């Protein structure tokens, strides 16, 4: 809940970085899911798979919050996870980058 | 909601037939699930897979109702689906078999 003004260039650059990170992570999840599915030998084993999928959807939902008021926190958190690099967001304002860096400290 | 008395031999035979049918159907579902999972190419496609799994769990839950008051209906319904044959339940009472046959008519 950072109420700053975003330029068109800022929303464009943010969209590119958000998408790149989300795409990479979802690819990872899809590969893991498929692996787990293939490894199933007994019907009851579908249960733990559903537990995984639920946890992953919730995780993604919370982490990839595409609301501008939240994007500085999101980016910081992705930088902390090493899914985004600060260089990718250099076009954003210095104010924004400061907030992102602080968010990468939580 | 058929309130009849069941002998030990009757519950034993019923258990054998119930298990045989459930085992076959769950094997089918597991194979289909695995096929669908393997065929997924995009993350969003996990959604329709979850819709399938939910429908299948509900279906099984309702159909394989292991309560003695309901087993004559269950068996009749499985006979109608061709997952059980009446010969498998010949050891049950004639009264029970009559109820099963009527249930196979719905």
Numbering used by the authors:
A (entry chain A), B (entry chain A): 1 to 106
Direct quotes from the study:
However, the most common paralogue OCP1 relies on an allosteric regulation for photo-recovery: OCP1 interacts with the fluorescence recovery protein (FRP), a small, dimeric regulator that terminates the interaction with the phycobilisome, and strongly accelerates the back-conversion of OCPR into the resting orange state. We show that this interaction between the orange carotenoid protein (OCP) and its unrelated regulator, the fluorescence recovery protein (FRP), evolved when a precursor of FRP was horizontally acquired by cyanobacteria. Homologues of FRP (termed FRP-like, FRPL) can also be found in distantly related bacteria, mainly proteobacteria and acidobacteria, suggesting an origin far beyond cyanobacteria.
